[PDB]
Amino acid sequence: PITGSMDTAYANSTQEETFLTSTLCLYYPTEAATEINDNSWKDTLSQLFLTKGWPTGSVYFKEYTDIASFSVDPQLYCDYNVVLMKYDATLQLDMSELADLILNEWLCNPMDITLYYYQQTDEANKWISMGSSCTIKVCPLNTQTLGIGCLTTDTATFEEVATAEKLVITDVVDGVNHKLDVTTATCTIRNCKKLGPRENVAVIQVGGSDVLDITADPTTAPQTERMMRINWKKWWQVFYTVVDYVNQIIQAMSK
Amino acid sequence: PITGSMDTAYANSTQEETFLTSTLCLYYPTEAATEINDNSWKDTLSQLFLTKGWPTGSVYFKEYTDIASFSVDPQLYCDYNVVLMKYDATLQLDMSELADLILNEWLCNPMDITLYYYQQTDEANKWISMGSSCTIKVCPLNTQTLGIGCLTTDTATFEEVATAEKLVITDVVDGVNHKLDVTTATCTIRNCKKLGPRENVAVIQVGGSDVLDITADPTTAPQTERMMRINWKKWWQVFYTVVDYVNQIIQAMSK
Amino acid sequence: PITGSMDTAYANSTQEETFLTSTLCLYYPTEAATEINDNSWKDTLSQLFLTKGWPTGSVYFKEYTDIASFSVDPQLYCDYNVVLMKYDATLQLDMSELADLILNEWLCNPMDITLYYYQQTDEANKWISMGSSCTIKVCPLNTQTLGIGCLTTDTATFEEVATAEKLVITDVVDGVNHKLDVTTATCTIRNCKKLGPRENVAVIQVGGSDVLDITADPTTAPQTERMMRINWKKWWQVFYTVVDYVNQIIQAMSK
Amino acid sequence: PITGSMDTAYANSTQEETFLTSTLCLYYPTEAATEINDNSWKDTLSQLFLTKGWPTGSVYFKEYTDIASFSVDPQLYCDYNVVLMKYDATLQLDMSELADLILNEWLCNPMDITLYYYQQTDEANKWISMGSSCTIKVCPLNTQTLGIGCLTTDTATFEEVATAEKLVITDVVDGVNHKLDVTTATCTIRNCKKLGPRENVAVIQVGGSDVLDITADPTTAPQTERMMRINWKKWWQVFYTVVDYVNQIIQAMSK
Ligand SMILES: [Ca+2]
Ligand SMILES: [Ca+2]
Ligand SMILES: [Ca+2]
Ligand SMILES: [Ca+2]
Ligand SMILES: [Ca+2]
Ligand SMILES: [Ca+2]
Ligand SMILES: [Ca+2]
Ligand SMILES: [Ca+2]
C-alpha cells in the first residue's frame, strides 16, 4: 500500500526516461532479413531509431530462423522485446505455444519422468517441455498407481499427446497422477505454474486475419495490448512502421 | 413476474445439482476418434469424468462422421451437448448453417413446394432444408403470381440458391412470394421461425483463427458464450481439456 | 454550436427521406455476376428493391472485375455505395489498401518525385500511389540530403517497398526526408493526409473468417459499422440478403 | 519502509525454516572427487547431512572440472550454493574473475561488436565476456570516431587485453568509446552493470595463504562473509568440515 490521495500531479513525459535508460530488442525471422537484402539494414534502421529517440548503442537485432527454434532458445536479451511473427498457417499452434511463453510470466521446476509420476494442480499448472524433438506419451493413474486405459509397464499403451514438437505446453485433467514418457534424449519437460504476464514482448503478427486463442480452456479468450497485428506488404515496410511507432509499441509494454 | 426484493441470498453451488441430475453428450468427428486409436478411450475419459464430478452412467459419446451428416441427423440426445468441430476451410458455411441450428432455438412447419408458393415474414423467418442432396431454385412473384426474371412454368429460368447441400438455411427478400423448386426426392424443406437460443450446445471450435459470422444479415455479429474455441495440438489433448474444464463449459450453457 | 436543450422530440422515420431523395450503388466483382447467369438479374433485383423502398430509377449496379482495378478506378458514383468483396486470401493487403481508401475520407496533393525528396508528418500523412504497375523504391536522407544506407545517385541501393501493385498506401518513418523512385510511367504517387471517415461505403465481406486490421500501426485496431460481413453460400443469396437488409446497411452509413 | 518500533522480539531459530524449505548445492573440482575414490561418497555425505538437519532430497553435488569451465557454465542450481576452490597459483586471476561473478549480483545486455563501438560509464559498468577462447583487442576512440594509437581499420594496431581466456571481466578508462575486436566465434561479450551481491555462494578457498583482491581498482579491498577459507589436508576432511559447519556457512549467505 500506497496512500490513495489524489494530488493529482502527473509527472511529465514517461517516454523520456525510457529513451535514456532502456534497451530495445527486435526479433525477426530469417526470411524477413533475407528479403531486405542489404548489408546495412540493421544500421540504417538504427539511425532511423534516433529519430524516435533511441541513442545509438540502444537497439539490438536478434534473428530467429524459425518459430520452433526461437520458441526454445528465446532468452530475451533486452529490457523491451518486440518479436515479429509472420503468419505460417500450418505452424499456428507452434506459434500459440511460443506466444503463451513470451507474453506471460512463468515459474518452473524440473521433473524426473523416470522416478515420480506427476499431476497438475490448477488452471495454472502446466507442463512446458521443449527441445530438438519433443514426443510426450501419458498414462493416467487411478488412486492405486494403476493405469486407466494403460499399463504403467508398456508405453505402447500410453496416450500420445505430442509428436516431435520444438515447444509444447501440455495440459492434463487436473488432479490426476500420470506416468509420463517423454523422449528426454532430445526433450526437456518442466513443471510450470503461470501468472504474471509480461510487461515487455509485443508479439506483432504479420499476416492472415487473426484473432488468437491463447487459452488452454474453451471458455476464455484473452486479448492483451502486448499482442499487436500489422498488415503485410513488404518487410522493409514492416520495419519502417515498427520504427515509426516504437514508442506506441513500447508504451503498450513497460518494465 | 417475480418479486424483486434483494434478499440477497445466493443458494450455494449450482454445479452440485447438475452433477447429480444431468447428462453430458460429447459430439466429435470420426477423425477425432481414429487419431486416438484406443478401444477404451471412451472408458478412460469416463473415469476421468468422475474427477470433475459426473457419475459413471452420466456421460455419452456420439460420433458424427461429417459436418454435413451431423448437421442433418443431429438429434441432441442429452441434457447438455458440447459438440467438437475442427476447422475444415472449404466447409465453413456448412459449419455456419449447422451452428446456426444447434446454438439456436427453432420453430418449424412443413412446406408444400408443389401446391403453394411461399414468403418469409421477418428477420426471423427462414427456410431450413436438409437431407441427402439439397438443391433449391427460387422464382420471386410480383403481386400477380407472375415471375420476376422467371416463368413460373419453366424451372430453367429459376434462380439457384443452393446446389446439393446437406443443410441449408435459405434467406429471401422479406415480404415477397416465391415459387420454390426443391429436389424433394433427396431434400426436405421446412419453414422456420427463429428465436430462443440454446442453453445447451457449446460448439467448441478446433482450429484456424476464428471469428464466426453466424448472422444472415451484414449488420450484426453475435458472439455468445455457447460458442467456444480450443487450440489444436492432438485430439487426446482436446478431450483432456474438455474434461479438465467440463464445468466451465457446462456453466456457459444450462437447462 | 448547437443549442443543447433536450426538447426531446425525435422527428419520425429517417428512412423515408433517404428512399425518396438518395441513390444506392452496388459494387460487385465479375465472378459474382457470372455465377448468376441471367440477362435480367440487375432488373429482377431492382423490382425487389422497390419492396425495401427504392424507386425504380434509384439503384445502380457497377462491375469491378478485380480488387486491383476497382482499387484504382473506384470513383464512387452514388450517394450510398455498398461494395461487395469476396475473400481471396493472396490479395488480402490489396483488399486492405482498397478498404482504407473507400472507408475513409482522404485529402491529397501531387508529388514530384523528380525534383523534391519528401517526408510524412504525422500518423495521418501517408503516400497513396496507384496505377498499372506501382513499384516504389525509397532512400532515407539524413539532415544533409545524403543517403542512409543508400546513394541518392544509384537507385540500385534504394529500398524497395512495393513491387508492382495496383494500389499502395506507403508508410515511412515520420519526420525523415526520402528521395523517392517510383515508376511514374505506369504509376501515380500522391501525398495524402487522412481523416474523415466515410459515411457511405459499407464494405461487405464475403468469406473467410475475418477480423480486419486496417491500421498502419500495430497498436490500434478499428472496427467500424461501415465494415460488414456475410456468410457465403451462393451469389444469388448474397444479393437477396443485401436487398432484404438495404436499410439496415444504409443506416450503418448516411450522408 | 518499515516501521522502526523496537518491539524487540526476536522470532526463534531461523535455521529451522531453511532446513525445511531450502536446497544446498556443493560445487567442487574433479580432482576433489577423484581423491575420494568411492562410488558412494555423495551418498555417505548425504546421510551425514541429515545430522546437520537437511532432509534426504535436499543436498545436490555439482562437479566442475576446471575453474575455467565452471566460470562459464556455472548456472547456479540451488537456493544455496557453496563452491569449493583449491588454490592453483597460475590460475589466480581466472579464479578472481569467477569469484567476482558468483559472489556478486550482475545485470547484462548484449553487445554487437560488429556494428557499434562502445564505452563503460561508472566504476560499475564492466564488460564480462566468456566462452571457449576469449581474445579481446581494443581501440580507444577520440571524439571523432578516430583511433588513438590505432586505426579503426586494421586490428593489427589494436591493444590486446585478453588472450584466450574462459572468463574475462574487462575494464577500460571510463567515458571513452572503443571499437572492440573480440573473437565472437568462440567468445561472447556482454555489457554488465554490477551491484547487488550475493546472498548465496560462499566461495570456500582451499589452500595457499590468501587475501583476495577482487576489486578492479587499487584503492579498495572488500572482504565479505561469503568469502571463506579452509586449511587443506585431504579432500575427505574438507567435506567433513563443510558438513560439520553447514549452518555456519549457510548463515553467512541467505536468500
Ligand atoms: Ca492407450
Ligand atoms: Ca490443468
Ligand atoms: Ca433466372
Ligand atoms: Ca428474411
Ligand atoms: Ca539499399
Ligand atoms: Ca507516418
Ligand atoms: Ca596498438
Ligand atoms: Ca570503468
Resolution value, angstrom units: 3.8
Judge whether B220 and C227 are in contact, CB under 8 Å.
no
User: Which among A219, A220, A227, A229 is the top mutation candidate for probing chain B, defined by the most B β-carbons within 10 Å of its own β-carbon?
Assistant: A219
Question: Is there a domain that residue B3 lies in?
Answer: no
Residue D227: inside a domain = yes
For A19, the grid coordinates are 529513451
Q: Is residue C113 part of a domain?
A: yes
Choose one of D145, D172, D194: the last residue of a domain.
Answer: D194
Q: Please give the grid coordinates belonging to residue D229.
A: 577459507
CATH of the domain at C184: 2.60.120.800
Residue contacts between A and B (CB atoms, under 8 Å): 97
> What are the residues whose beta carbons fall under 8 Å from the beta carbon of A134, sequence distance 6 or more?
A162, A164, A165, A166, A167, A168, A182, A183, A186, A187, A189
What's the gap in Å between D216 CA and the centre of ligand 8?
A: 8
Question: In terms of CA atoms, which chain A residue is nearest residue B46?
Answer: A148
Specify whether D227 is located in the same domain as D179: no
Distances (CA, A) of A48 to A244, C149, C171, C237, D32: 9, 11, 14, 51, 56
Residues B109/B51, Cβ–Cβ less than 8 Å: no
CB C213 within 8 A of CB C221: yes
| Residue whose C-alpha cell is 447467369 | C37
Determine, yes or no, domain membership for B20.
Answer: yes
Give the CATH number of the domain where residue D55 resides.
3.40.50.11130
Domain boundary among B175, B194, B213: B194
State the best of D115, D178, D188, D189 to mutate against chain A, taking most chain A CBs within 10 Å: D115
Residues C29 and C45 in one domain: yes
Dihedral, C128, C129, C131, C132 alpha carbons, nearest 10: -130
Q: Which amino acid is at D220?
A: T
If asked whether residues A48 and A129 sit together in one domain, one would say no
Same domain? For D205 and D97 the reply is yes
A192 within 8 A of A106, measured Cβ to Cβ: yes
Tell whether C6 is covered by a domain: no
Give the bridge partners for B58, in sequence order: none
Q: Which experimental technique did the depositors report for determining this structure? A: cryo-EM
**B98 and B220 in one domain?**
yes
Where among D173, D194, D215 does a domain terminate? D194
Q: Are residues D176 and D112 in the same domain?
A: yes
C221 vs A229, A236, A245: nearest CB? A229
Chains with 3 or more CB pairs under 8 A to chain D? A
C-alpha C88/C-alpha D104 separation (Å) is 59
How far away is chain A from the Cα of B8, in angstroms, using its nearest Cα? 28
Let me know if residue A9 belongs to a domain. no
Query: Same structural domain for residues B222 and B177?
Result: no
- Residues A23, A41, single domain; the answer is yes
| CA D102/CA D89 separation, integer angstroms | 20
Whole-angstrom CA distances from B191 to A52, B102, B110, B170, C150 are 62, 17, 6, 10, 69
Coil/strand/helix, residue A83: strand
For residue A120, how far is its CA from the centre of ligand 2 (angstroms)?
Answer: 5
Question: Which residues in chain A have Cβ-Cβ distances shorter than 8 Å to D115?
Answer: 42-43, 46
Domain span at A119: 106-194
- Does residue A27 belong to any structural domain of this protein? yes
The grid cell for D41 is 561418497
Q: Which member of A47, A48, A233 has the closest CB to residue C93? A: A233
Q: How many alpha carbons lie under 13 Å from residue D155 in its C-beta half-sphere?
A: 13
One domain, residues B48 and B73: yes
Is the residue at B6 inside a domain? Answer: no
The total domain count for chain A is: 2
Pairs across B and C, CB distance < 8 A: 97
Secondary structure class of A246 (helix, strand, coil): helix
The count of C-alpha atoms lying within 13 angstroms of the C-alpha of A114, restricted to the half-sphere facing its C-beta, is 5
Q: Are residues C117 and C68 in the same domain?
A: no
Instruction: Give the C-alpha distances (Å, rounded to integers) separating D125 from A166, A250, C137, D172, D218.
Output: 37, 25, 42, 10, 17
- Looking at the fold, whether D55 and D131 belong to one and the same domain comes out as no
What is the maximum span of chain D, computed from C-alpha positions, in angstroms? 68
- In angstroms, rounded to a whole number, what is the distance separating the alpha carbons of residues B181 and B109? 18
Count of Cβ atoms closer than 10 Å to residue C196 Cβ? 9
Whether residue B89 sits in one domain with residue B75: yes
